[PDB]
Design a protein around this nucleic acid. Structure first.
Ligand SMILES: [Mg+2]
Ligand SMILES: [Mg+2]
Ligand SMILES: [Mg+2]
Ligand SMILES: [Mg+2]
Ligand SMILES: [Mg+2]
Ligand SMILES: [Mg+2]
Ligand SMILES: [Mg+2]
Ligand SMILES: [Mg+2]
Ligand SMILES: [Mg+2]
Ligand SMILES: [Mg+2]
Ligand SMILES: [Mg+2]
Ligand SMILES: [Mg+2]
Ligand SMILES: [Mg+2]
Ligand SMILES: [Mg+2]
Ligand SMILES: [Mg+2]
Ligand SMILES: [Mg+2]
Ligand SMILES: [Mg+2]
Ligand SMILES: [Mg+2]
Ligand SMILES: [Mg+2]
Lengths: 129, 14, 155, 205, 80, 82
RNA sequence: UUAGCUAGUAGGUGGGGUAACGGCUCACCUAGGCGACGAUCCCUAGCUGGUCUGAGAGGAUGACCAGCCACACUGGAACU
RNA sequence: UACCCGCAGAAGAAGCACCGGCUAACUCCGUGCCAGCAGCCGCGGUAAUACGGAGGGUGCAAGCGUUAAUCGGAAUUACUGGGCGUAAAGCGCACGCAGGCGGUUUGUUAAGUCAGAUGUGAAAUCCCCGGGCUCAACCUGGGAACUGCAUCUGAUACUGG
């Protein structure tokens, strides 16, 4: 059903980005905040707010160029049907280093560019292309 | 198509 | 100043009351060797009339693309009817390795060092359409920095 | 392991000066240079996309006299070496021992310069190497042995290459009858019109 | 410190011996899916205190019989 | 038994020897234990071509390893030249 | 288009046994053991370090070299 | 024995396959869907560069062709990297065990995973820089590689309890 909520999060981002929507809403969680705040610090989105404490509702502000999609495509890599893990030197790049790869480690959620100074590996979340 | 289907039986090489 | 190359010639026909009337289809590409490719298409009775009409459309329908010293910025997927196009930029001095269809597109842009492989159908008219449209959605590190907004090492 | 046919017939097949003779007699005063060998030499042939990789390969191999079994072995080394493929391809072709003798001018033709290497005349650092396919290391000095100095094939060849221009990386001494292979040549130091990328693509399939 | 396995008991009918099953997660060499692999060992049970479904701690010993090569340490949880 | 001997490698008409420690029941190129050094009989003897290590030698001789007469010639000349 | 297989079989006591632990062997006691994570049956095959192919992942195989196991007309047995 | 000195004179030392397209090279005669050719496409009943021969050429080379076999091409058993409305394919439908999977918050365990380290992964082969045999093949020095497995100490975001 909603068994991969991160893949449900990537579905709601990719649709409203392409369909010229100004802002989207989604059910919040701890892990969804730990991904959207990284995308806010990497220039892909604008802002996020939390609403509700018994039903946590996350909101995302979209971002455009001249009415053109900033996030052109995003790819869920690991999934509950097949888990993907890499080491500190087998971290894949997106568009040969242009896009970022969201990898959550013990030192929080960071990119593979940020995992060079950290020297860790773990679960690949999404290819932000 | 499903990876979990190939756990039971792999792709049958002719 | 323009660099041209014929790709393929295929005789087609049209059936009428008196029988069959033949014609010719010619696919050509032009370019300047500096990141500008324009492809055309021709339909005429005669073969030098067929290749000339393809050249007449080739002056327009010509786009711009961001090169990185004669090679691609990043590998990019191409999708069409039956032409799964997968390119990848290579190191300096590898040379053009591709099919005869893709070599006409890659030479007229000035591109030297690219990996190339086409999966699926081998129709030369369908391979080049995803090849052109695979370059226009291929983007530059400067224009993704106009998205992200930072003048740091990624530029 | 050679080619015993006519020399300029290969240039009649290609249409490019290959330095197969000395230079005393002109290139067009012996044969029609844009005529193919045979019945339809005046008829213009069609040039396919497969041709321009093949005709470029035949141009270079007929200069150095390297057959297909050895020229593929050069591609086996040019792939394994780092850097540019075509730049490393020229390093094996120019570093041949019969080419070093020819570009200094001890032999008037490349066929004559191969025989001077073969028939016991070249010293490499005081040592005689009688095979024409020796890869010459940098910072070496080559010379003529004491018995082959009196031969007229050296006396007649020191004035023909002296009229032509000399390469930069070589140091030709005619009075002592010796030479120096200093460094590795570059792409721009050699023939610019030879496109090395046309040959690599044929072995890339 | 010494080599030590942990698991649960699937059979206890025989005297002075129990059957302990060990499960482990394995990356498949072709696809990568983590698959539970069952290792069924025969463990020497002194005084016969182990019942069904007991999470138990076992260690390594010499071969005591035709099929047994493991011995008992202590029961983590009994008869819940 | 634990012995010190040679192992003939190299092409035909080009002799070369490996300095290994092995058992007497193995062949010349048989199952060794460790590599010790090397020997070149067709060496020019102006440069490299013979090098061993006395630390690994004294570790096995003290344990009781037998030595063949051909390998012991290298032992009797390792102190003259060094 | 193989689903049930197995009574020295699974475990225990004691005796015996080999260089060593042990159903390795014997009497007695228990009725368990194995198995849809392929028991069992049928067919085929020496295996591995590797070679070859392939951008890689994979793919096919195991001659020469080296490591191990088995075998020495067929079958069985013990001595030294 | 390699090696080297000395002698005589180009004297002792080049062939095979192809030539319609794929795929490098074009004309001529003979034959007449007969003979033949052929890996594919399909050539030849009155003008065949495709048959047979000649002329000439091309690609190789002391080798050159053919047959058989393995992989590649083949993303044509698709993990990388395929599809299932009509091209081959969604069981006629439903229940449901085993199996796979699972919303959200916190604590704990560190199981999976990741970081570091030890031990190990025989040599030879492959790769990196060298050296040696006149050269190459070949032999060989050290390093890397062998992405493996076992153990200890760590980190706790995600997965598991
Ligand atoms: Mg159009
Ligand atoms: Mg197809
Ligand atoms: Mg022999
Ligand atoms: Mg007993
Ligand atoms: Mg033998
Ligand atoms: Mg053997
Ligand atoms: Mg042609
Ligand atoms: Mg024939
Ligand atoms: Mg006729
Ligand atoms: Mg030969
Ligand atoms: Mg076959
Ligand atoms: Mg395949
Ligand atoms: Mg398909
Ligand atoms: Mg159908
Ligand atoms: Mg239905
Ligand atoms: Mg090894
Ligand atoms: Mg070694
Ligand atoms: Mg080696
Ligand atoms: Mg050398």
């Amino acid at each position: 059903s909603m068994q991969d909520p991160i893949a449900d999060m990537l579905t709601r981002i990719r649709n409203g980005q392409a369909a010229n929507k100004a802002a989207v809403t989604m059910p919040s969680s701890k892990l969804k905040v730990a991904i959207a705040n990284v995308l806010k610090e990497e220039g892909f989105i604008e802002d996020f707010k939390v609403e509700g404490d018994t039903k946590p509702e996350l909101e995302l502000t979209l971002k455009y160029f001249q009415g053109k999609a900033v996030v052109e495509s995003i790819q869920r890599v690991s999934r509950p049907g097949l888990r993907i893990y890499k080491r500190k030197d087998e971290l894949p790049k997106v568009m040969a280093g242009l896009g970022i790869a969201v990898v959550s480690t013990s030192k929080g959620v960071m990119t593979d560019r940020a995992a060079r100074q950290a020297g860790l590996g773990g679960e690949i979340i999404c290819y932000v292309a | 198509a499903t990876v979990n289907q190939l756990v039971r039986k792999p792709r049958a090489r002719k | 100043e323009l660099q041209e190359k014929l790709i393929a010639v295929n005789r087609v026909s049209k059936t009428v009351k008196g029988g069959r009337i033949f014609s010719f289809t010619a696919l050509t590409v032009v370019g300047d060797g500096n990141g500008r490719v324009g492809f055309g298409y021709g339909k005429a009775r005669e073969v030098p009339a067929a290749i000339q009409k393809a050249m007449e459309k080739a002056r327009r329908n010509m786009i711009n693309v961001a090169l990185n010293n004669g090679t691609l910025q990043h590998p990019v997927k191409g999708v069409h009817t039956g032409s799964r196009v997968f390119m990848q930029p290579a190191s300096e001095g590898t040379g053009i390795i591709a099919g005869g269809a893709m070599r006409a597109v890659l030479e007229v842009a000035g591109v030297h060092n690219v990996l190339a492989k086409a999966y699926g159908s081998t129709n030369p008219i369908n391979v080049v359409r995803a090849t052109i449209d695979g370059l226009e959605n291929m983007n530059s590190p400067e224009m993704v920095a106009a998205k992200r907004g930072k003048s740091v090492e990624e530029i | 392991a050679r080619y015993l046919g006519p020399k300029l017939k290969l240039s009649r097949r290609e249409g490019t000066d290959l330095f197969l003779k000395s230079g005393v007699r002109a290139i067009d005063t012996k044969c029609k240079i844009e005529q193919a060998p045979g019945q339809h030499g005046a008829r213009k042939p069609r040039l396919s996309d497969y041709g321009v990789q093949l005709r470029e390969k035949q141009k270079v191999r007929r200069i150095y006299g390297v057959l297909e079994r050895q020229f593929r072995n050069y591609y086996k080394e040019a792939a394994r070496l780092k850097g540019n493929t075509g730049e490393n391809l020229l390093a094996l072709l120019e570093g041949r021992l019969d080419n070093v003798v020819y570009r200094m001018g001890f032999g008037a033709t490349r066929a004559e310069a191969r025989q001077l290497v073969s028939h016991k005349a070249i010293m490499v650092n005081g040592r005689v190497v009688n095979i024409a396919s020796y890869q010459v290391s940098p910072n070496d000095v080559v010379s003529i042995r004491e018995k082959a100095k009196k031969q007229s094939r050296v006396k007649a060849a020191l004035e023909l290459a002296e009229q032509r221009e000399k390469p930069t990386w070589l140091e030709v001494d005619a009075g002592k009858m010796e030479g120096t292979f200093k460094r590795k040549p570059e792409r721009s130091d050699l023939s610019a019109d030879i496109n090395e990328h046309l040959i690599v693509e044929l072995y890339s399939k | 410190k010494i080599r030590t396995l942990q698991g649960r008991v699937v059979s206890d009918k025989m005297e002075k011996s129990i059957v302990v099953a060990i499960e482990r997660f394995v990356k498949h060499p072709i696809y990568g899916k983590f698959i539970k692999r069952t290792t069924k060992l025969h463990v020497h049970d002194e005084n016969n205190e182990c019942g069904i479904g007991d999470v138990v701690e076992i260690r390594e010993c010499r071969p005591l019989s035709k099929t047994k090569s493991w011995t008992l340490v202590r029961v983590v949880e009994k008869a819940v | 038994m634990v012995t010190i001997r040679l192992a003939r490698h190299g092409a035909k008409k080009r002799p070369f020897y490996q300095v290994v420690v092995a058992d007497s029941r193995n062949a010349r190129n048989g199952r060794f234990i460790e590599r010790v050094g090397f020997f070149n009989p067709i060496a020019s003897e102006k440069e490299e071509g013979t090098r061993l290590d006395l630390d690994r030698i004294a570790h096995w001789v003290g344990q009781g390893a037998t030595i063949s007469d051909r390998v012991a010639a290298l032992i009797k000349e390792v102190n003259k030249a060094a």
